[PDB]
Coordinates of N, CA and C in Angstrom, one line a residue:
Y1 N -26.8 3.7 28.3 CA -27.7 3.3 27.9 C -29.1 3.2 28.0
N2 N -29.7 4.1 28.2 CA -31.2 4.2 28.8 C -30.6 4.6 30.2
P3 N -29.8 5.5 30.3 CA -29.6 6.0 31.5 C -30.6 7.0 32.5
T4 N -30.1 7.4 33.5 CA -31.2 7.7 34.7 C -30.9 9.3 34.0
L5 N -31.1 10.3 34.7 CA -31.2 12.2 34.8 C -30.7 12.6 35.8
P6 N -29.9 13.8 36.2 CA -28.8 14.2 34.9 C -28.4 13.3 34.1
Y7 N -27.6 13.8 33.2 CA -26.6 12.7 32.3 C -25.8 13.2 32.1
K8 N -24.7 13.2 32.5 CA -23.3 14.2 32.3 C -22.1 12.4 31.3
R9 N -21.9 12.6 30.2 CA -21.1 12.2 29.4 C -20.2 12.1 29.3
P10 N -18.9 12.3 29.6 CA -17.2 12.5 28.8 C -17.4 12.4 27.5
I11 N -17.0 13.5 26.4 CA -16.5 12.6 25.2 C -15.4 11.9 24.8
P12 N -15.3 11.1 24.8 CA -13.8 10.3 24.3 C -12.7 11.0 23.6
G13 N -12.0 11.3 23.5 CA -10.9 12.2 23.0 C -11.4 13.1 22.6
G14 N -12.4 14.2 23.6 CA -12.8 15.5 22.8 C -13.6 16.1 21.6
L15 N -14.4 17.0 22.1 CA -15.1 17.1 20.7 C -14.2 17.7 19.5
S16 N -14.3 17.7 18.5 CA -13.8 18.2 16.9 C -14.7 18.5 16.1
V17 N -14.3 19.6 15.2 CA -15.0 19.9 14.1 C -14.7 18.7 12.8
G18 N -16.4 18.2 13.0 CA -16.6 16.8 11.7 C -17.1 16.2 12.5
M19 N -17.0 15.9 14.2 CA -17.8 15.4 14.5 C -19.9 15.4 14.6
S20 N -20.3 14.6 15.3 CA -21.3 14.6 15.3 C -22.3 13.7 16.7
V21 N -23.2 14.0 17.4 CA -23.9 13.6 18.5 C -25.1 13.3 18.0
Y22 N -25.1 12.2 18.6 CA -26.5 11.4 17.9 C -27.5 11.4 19.6
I23 N -28.6 11.8 19.6 CA -29.6 11.8 20.8 C -30.7 10.8 20.5
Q24 N -31.2 10.1 21.2 CA -32.1 9.2 20.7 C -33.2 9.5 22.3
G25 N -34.1 9.5 22.5 CA -35.0 10.1 23.5 C -36.6 10.3 23.5
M26 N -37.6 10.1 24.3 CA -38.2 10.6 24.6 C -38.8 11.9 25.0
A27 N -39.6 12.9 24.9 CA -40.5 14.2 25.2 C -41.5 13.3 26.2
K28 N -41.7 13.7 27.6 CA -42.3 13.4 28.7 C -43.9 14.1 28.1
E29 N -44.8 13.5 28.2 CA -46.0 13.5 28.2 C -46.6 15.0 28.7
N30 N -46.0 15.1 29.8 CA -45.9 16.8 30.1 C -45.1 17.2 30.6
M31 N -44.1 17.2 29.2 CA -43.3 17.9 29.0 C -43.3 19.8 29.1
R32 N -42.2 20.3 29.9 CA -42.5 22.0 29.8 C -41.0 22.0 29.0
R33 N -40.0 21.7 29.2 CA -38.8 21.6 29.0 C -37.9 21.0 28.9
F34 N -36.6 20.4 28.3 CA -35.4 20.0 28.9 C -33.8 20.4 28.1
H35 N -32.9 20.0 28.2 CA -31.6 20.6 27.6 C -30.6 19.7 27.5
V36 N -29.9 20.1 26.5 CA -28.5 19.3 26.2 C -27.6 20.5 26.2
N37 N -26.6 20.2 26.7 CA -25.4 21.2 27.0 C -24.0 20.8 26.9
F38 N -23.5 21.5 26.3 CA -22.1 21.1 25.4 C -21.1 21.5 26.5
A39 N -21.2 21.2 27.8 CA -20.0 21.8 28.6 C -18.4 21.5 28.5
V40 N -17.6 22.3 29.3 CA -16.5 22.4 29.1 C -15.9 21.9 30.5
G41 N -16.8 20.9 31.1 CA -16.1 20.9 32.6 C -17.1 19.2 33.3
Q42 N -16.4 19.2 34.2 CA -17.3 17.5 34.9 C -18.5 17.9 35.9
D43 N -18.0 19.3 36.6 CA -19.1 19.9 37.7 C -20.0 20.7 36.6
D44 N -20.9 20.5 37.2 CA -22.4 21.5 37.3 C -22.5 22.6 37.3
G45 N -21.4 23.6 37.7 CA -21.3 25.2 37.4 C -20.6 25.6 36.5
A46 N -20.0 24.5 35.8 CA -19.0 24.5 33.9 C -19.7 25.2 33.3
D47 N -18.5 26.3 32.3 CA -19.2 26.8 31.2 C -20.1 26.2 30.0
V48 N -20.9 26.6 29.4 CA -21.4 25.6 28.3 C -21.4 26.5 27.3
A49 N -20.6 25.6 26.1 CA -20.3 26.5 24.7 C -21.7 26.3 24.2
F50 N -23.0 25.4 24.2 CA -23.9 25.6 23.1 C -25.1 24.7 24.4
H51 N -25.9 25.6 24.4 CA -27.3 24.9 25.6 C -28.5 25.4 24.2
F52 N -28.4 24.3 24.2 CA -29.8 24.2 23.1 C -31.4 23.5 24.6
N53 N -32.2 24.4 24.4 CA -33.1 24.6 25.1 C -34.7 24.7 24.8
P54 N -35.5 23.1 24.5 CA -37.2 23.2 23.7 C -37.5 23.8 24.8
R55 N -38.4 24.8 25.3 CA -39.6 25.1 26.0 C -41.1 25.4 25.7
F56 N -41.5 24.6 26.2 CA -43.0 24.7 25.7 C -44.3 25.0 27.2
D57 N -44.2 26.7 26.9 CA -45.1 27.5 27.4 C -45.1 28.5 26.4
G58 N -46.3 29.5 26.4 CA -46.7 29.8 25.6 C -46.3 29.5 24.3
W59 N -45.3 30.3 23.4 CA -44.7 30.2 22.4 C -43.5 29.1 22.2
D60 N -44.3 27.7 22.0 CA -43.3 26.8 22.2 C -42.3 26.9 21.3
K61 N -40.7 26.8 21.5 CA -39.7 27.3 20.8 C -38.7 27.0 21.5
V62 N -37.6 27.2 20.9 CA -36.2 26.4 21.3 C -35.4 27.7 21.6
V63 N -34.8 27.9 22.5 CA -33.7 28.6 22.8 C -32.1 28.0 23.0
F64 N -31.5 28.9 22.5 CA -29.8 28.8 22.3 C -29.1 29.6 23.2
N65 N -28.0 29.5 23.5 CA -27.5 30.2 24.7 C -26.2 29.6 24.7
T66 N -25.0 30.5 25.2 CA -23.6 30.2 25.7 C -23.5 30.5 27.0
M67 N -23.1 29.7 27.9 CA -22.5 30.2 29.0 C -21.1 30.5 29.5
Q68 N -20.6 31.8 29.5 CA -19.2 31.7 30.1 C -18.7 32.4 30.8
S69 N -18.1 32.0 31.8 CA -17.6 32.8 33.2 C -18.9 33.1 34.0
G70 N -20.0 31.6 34.2 CA -21.3 32.2 34.8 C -22.2 32.7 34.3
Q71 N -22.0 33.5 33.3 CA -22.6 34.6 32.6 C -23.3 33.8 31.6
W72 N -24.5 34.2 31.4 CA -25.4 33.6 29.7 C -24.9 34.8 28.9
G73 N -25.2 34.3 27.5 CA -24.9 35.4 26.7 C -26.1 35.8 26.1
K74 N -26.1 36.8 24.8 CA -27.3 36.7 23.7 C -28.0 35.6 24.0
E75 N -29.2 35.5 24.4 CA -30.0 34.5 23.8 C -30.7 34.4 22.3
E76 N -30.2 33.5 21.8 CA -31.0 32.8 20.1 C -32.2 32.2 20.6
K77 N -33.1 31.9 19.8 CA -34.2 31.5 19.6 C -34.9 31.2 18.1
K78 N -35.8 30.0 18.4 CA -35.9 29.8 17.1 C -37.8 29.4 17.4
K79 N -38.6 30.2 17.2 CA -40.2 30.0 17.8 C -40.8 28.6 16.9
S80 N -40.3 27.5 16.9 CA -40.9 26.2 16.7 C -40.5 25.2 16.9
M81 N -41.5 24.2 17.5 CA -41.5 23.4 18.3 C -41.3 21.8 17.4
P82 N -40.2 21.0 17.2 CA -39.9 20.3 16.7 C -40.3 18.7 17.6
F83 N -40.3 18.8 19.2 CA -40.1 17.8 19.6 C -42.2 17.9 20.0
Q84 N -42.5 17.0 20.0 CA -44.2 16.6 20.6 C -44.1 15.6 21.7
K85 N -45.2 16.4 23.2 CA -44.9 15.4 24.1 C -45.5 14.7 24.2
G86 N -44.5 13.3 24.5 CA -44.8 11.9 24.3 C -44.4 11.1 23.5
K87 N -44.1 11.6 22.8 CA -43.6 11.1 21.3 C -41.6 11.0 21.5
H88 N -41.4 9.9 20.7 CA -39.9 9.5 20.3 C -39.3 10.5 19.6
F89 N -38.2 10.9 19.8 CA -37.5 11.6 18.9 C -35.9 11.4 18.5
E90 N -35.4 12.2 17.3 CA -34.2 11.7 17.0 C -33.1 13.2 17.0
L91 N -32.6 13.6 18.0 CA -31.9 14.9 18.0 C -30.2 14.7 17.3
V92 N -30.1 15.5 16.3 CA -28.6 15.2 15.8 C -27.7 16.6 15.8
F93 N -26.6 16.5 16.5 CA -26.2 17.7 16.1 C -24.7 17.3 15.5
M94 N -24.6 18.5 14.3 CA -23.5 18.3 13.8 C -22.3 19.1 14.0
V95 N -20.8 19.1 13.8 CA -20.2 20.1 14.2 C -19.5 20.7 13.3
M96 N -19.7 21.5 12.2 CA -19.4 21.9 11.5 C -17.9 23.1 11.9
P97 N -17.3 23.5 10.9 CA -16.5 24.7 11.1 C -17.1 26.1 12.0
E98 N -18.1 26.7 11.2 CA -18.9 27.6 11.7 C -19.5 27.7 12.7
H99 N -20.5 26.3 12.9 CA -21.7 26.3 14.2 C -22.0 24.8 14.4
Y100 N -22.6 24.7 14.9 CA -23.5 23.0 15.3 C -24.8 22.9 14.2
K101 N -25.2 22.3 13.7 CA -26.5 22.0 13.0 C -26.9 21.1 13.7
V102 N -28.2 21.2 13.9 CA -29.3 20.7 14.6 C -30.4 20.3 13.9
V103 N -30.6 19.1 13.7 CA -31.5 18.2 12.9 C -32.3 17.6 13.7
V104 N -33.4 17.2 13.8 CA -34.4 16.9 14.5 C -35.1 16.1 13.7
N105 N -35.4 14.5 13.8 CA -35.8 13.7 13.2 C -36.0 13.7 12.0
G106 N -34.7 14.0 11.4 CA -34.2 14.3 9.4 C -34.4 15.7 9.4
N107 N -35.0 16.5 10.0 CA -35.5 17.7 9.2 C -34.6 18.7 10.0
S108 N -33.7 19.8 9.5 CA -33.1 20.4 9.8 C -33.7 21.6 10.5
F109 N -33.2 22.0 11.5 CA -33.6 23.1 12.6 C -33.0 24.3 13.0
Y110 N -31.7 24.0 13.2 CA -30.8 25.2 13.5 C -29.3 25.1 13.1
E111 N -28.9 26.8 13.4 CA -27.2 26.2 12.7 C -27.0 27.5 14.2
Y112 N -26.2 27.1 15.2 CA -26.1 27.9 16.0 C -24.5 28.2 15.8
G113 N -23.8 29.4 15.6 CA -22.6 29.9 15.4 C -21.8 29.6 17.0
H114 N -20.6 29.2 17.0 CA -19.5 29.4 17.8 C -19.4 30.3 18.4
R115 N -19.1 30.2 19.9 CA -19.0 31.6 20.4 C -17.8 31.0 21.5
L116 N -17.9 29.9 21.9 CA -16.7 29.2 22.4 C -16.0 27.9 21.7
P117 N -14.4 27.9 21.6 CA -14.0 27.1 21.0 C -14.4 25.9 20.9
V118 N -14.9 24.8 20.2 CA -15.7 23.7 19.8 C -15.1 22.8 20.9
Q119 N -13.1 22.9 21.1 CA -12.4 21.9 21.5 C -12.4 22.0 22.9
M120 N -13.0 22.9 23.6 CA -13.3 23.1 24.8 C -14.1 22.4 25.7
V121 N -14.9 21.5 24.8 CA -16.0 21.0 25.0 C -15.4 19.4 25.7
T122 N -15.9 18.9 26.9 CA -15.8 18.0 27.6 C -16.7 17.0 28.1
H123 N -17.5 17.5 28.1 CA -19.4 16.8 28.6 C -20.2 17.1 28.0
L124 N -21.1 16.0 27.4 CA -22.4 16.4 27.2 C -23.3 16.2 28.1
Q125 N -24.0 16.9 28.4 CA -25.0 16.7 29.6 C -26.9 17.2 28.9
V126 N -27.3 16.3 30.0 CA -28.6 16.3 29.7 C -29.6 15.8 30.8
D127 N -30.8 17.2 30.4 CA -31.8 17.1 31.7 C -33.2 17.5 31.7
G128 N -33.6 17.4 32.0 CA -35.1 18.0 31.4 C -36.5 16.6 32.0
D129 N -37.1 17.1 31.2 CA -38.8 16.5 31.2 C -38.4 15.4 29.7
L130 N -37.7 14.6 30.1 CA -37.8 13.6 28.8 C -37.1 12.4 29.2
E131 N -37.5 11.4 28.3 CA -36.6 9.8 29.1 C -35.5 10.2 27.9
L132 N -34.2 9.7 28.2 CA -33.2 9.7 28.0 C -33.0 7.8 27.4
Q133 N -32.7 7.9 26.1 CA -32.2 6.5 25.4 C -31.0 6.2 25.1
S134 N -30.1 7.2 24.4 CA -29.0 7.2 24.3 C -28.3 8.3 23.8
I135 N -26.8 8.4 23.9 CA -26.1 9.4 23.2 C -24.7 8.6 22.7
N136 N -24.8 8.6 21.2 CA -23.9 8.2 20.7 C -22.8 9.2 20.0
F137 N -21.7 9.4 19.7 CA -20.4 9.6 19.1 C -20.6 9.5 18.0
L138 N -20.2 10.4 17.0 CA -19.9 9.8 15.9 C -18.4 10.8 15.0
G139 N -17.4 10.1 13.8 CA -16.6 11.0 13.7 C -15.3 11.1 14.4
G140 N -14.2 11.9 14.1 CA -13.2 12.0 15.3 C -12.1 11.0 15.5
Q141 N -11.5 11.3 16.3 CA -11.0 10.3 17.0 C -11.1 9.7 18.6
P142 N -12.1 8.5 18.4 CA -12.4 7.8 19.6 C -11.4 7.8 21.3
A143 N -10.3 8.1 20.7 CA -9.1 7.4 21.8 C -9.4 6.3 22.8
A144 N -10.1 6.2 24.1 CA -10.2 5.4 24.7 C -11.6 4.1 24.6
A145 N -12.5 4.8 23.9 CA -14.1 4.6 23.6 C -14.0 3.4 22.1
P146 N -14.1 1.8 23.0 CA -14.5 0.9 22.0 C -15.2 1.3 20.5
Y147 N -15.4 0.5 19.5 CA -16.6 0.5 18.9 C -16.9 -0.3 18.0

């Protein structure tokens, strides 16, 4: 709840199709980039099923990729920037059978097809030029997380 950075949060009960990740934060006034990782492990070198990476340099854009066995795969990207320097934003990831759907501030933004099984994701990692306000989960079985 208004954590530091980097922020690593275990997903109570694991990640499953149907769930949603709700991120509230603020892009820094001097932001260059930041990322959200759907990681498969606690450690920093853990593989990443879905890497969401907004980049503010040259062509303002967002990069999407997967890291398996320490190797980044084919990079995907949308040459559009839904975030604004110094502005509060609402990032929502919905897990569907075929892909993660990204919605920024209510605006549908992208659909990243699954490369790594959704269920291998155990942690949500956030870091970069932003202020993190909160990370919330919706749907699925909460296991030990109270609500």
